[PDB]
Write a protein that binds this DNA or RNA. Sequence first.
DNA 1: CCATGCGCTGAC
DNA 2: GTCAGGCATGG
Length: 327
Amino acid sequence: MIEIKDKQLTGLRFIDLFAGLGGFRLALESCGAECVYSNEWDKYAQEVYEMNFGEKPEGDITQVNEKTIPDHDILCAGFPCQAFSISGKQKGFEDSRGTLFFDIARIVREKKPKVVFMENVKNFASHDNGNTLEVVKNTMNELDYSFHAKVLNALDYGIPQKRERIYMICFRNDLNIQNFQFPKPFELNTFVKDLLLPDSEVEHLVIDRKDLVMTNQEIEQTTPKTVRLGIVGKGGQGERIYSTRGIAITLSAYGGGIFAKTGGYLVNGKTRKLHPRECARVMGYPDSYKVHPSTSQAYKQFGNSVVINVLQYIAYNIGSSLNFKPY
DNA sequence: CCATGCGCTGAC
DNA sequence: GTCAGGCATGG
Ligand SMILES: C[S@@+](CC[C@H](N)C(=O)[O-])C[C@H]1O[C@@H](n2cnc3c(N)ncnc32)[C@H](O)[C@@H]1O
């Protein structure tokens, strides 16, 4: 995460729905906003969130009466993606985990925040022949919000991970915001190798498979792209090895393979997965963030989370637009 | 609860 | 052609 000098969201209150690790909280709080409610139902996520923020989020949002939600200016929601990912069945709204958007809508109808700030997987934009995004747009428009949606790749915003996500920013119509812009990409100057822990700290993560096939020569020049060097097994998910002179593959919550959830990396002649602290870094979490004591739940949590830096640039732009109020 | 071998979708 | 992105069943 990045330093924010000019606190564009000072005086604003936000709610942290589907809170997970609290990435939206770190992002908005860095721009000066104050969290007034969080909701997250997973027991272990609630533990890490409490460890880090001092409060337990409320549980199952589907059972929460929207009248009881504190007044707020910005609603944040990285809602579940398993029903929309190209890695799963794509059942969308037919999946239990696919209809959480309508709980957001329910809350928005009652609370009417200034801004609604959502994230999902890149494929949310293409799912069900575009009808999924269409429904979202139409829902927000009928709630009296504008709808701004763009897929951003983390590697364009200072973070060495190929994580493409759709970001959805909605402004209440009475505010008349006409100048919201998604942040402009810039050159990447940080690579996986720059975020790695000392070899002494990660010996236990080294995997030595006898069926490793090294397909490509290691690179000396750093590059803002993934660079696959070899595979194990049949080369499915978690069976692929990358150069640390490129960027990380997308971290995943439920991913399998021998290099599950992180992917494999060539480091000093050996292949290993990433440490949870390296996953934290690849998601833009500060080293001060406290990781869950279950390494298993930690990998799951970072794989489900958001890239903090990207949310920081967007939040700053939302603040810039809200504060532009000439006579 | 965790591990890991898919399995096939998307997108070039 | 070249690749990257959760589910099932085992323990
Ligand atoms: C994919 S992630 C969000 C990650 C978050 N943006 C971050 O900074 O870590 C979705 C989260 O929604 C939670 N979730 C799913 N269904 C829920 C429900 N019905 N009520 C509350 N939380 C739910 C999941 O446990 C998961 O942590």
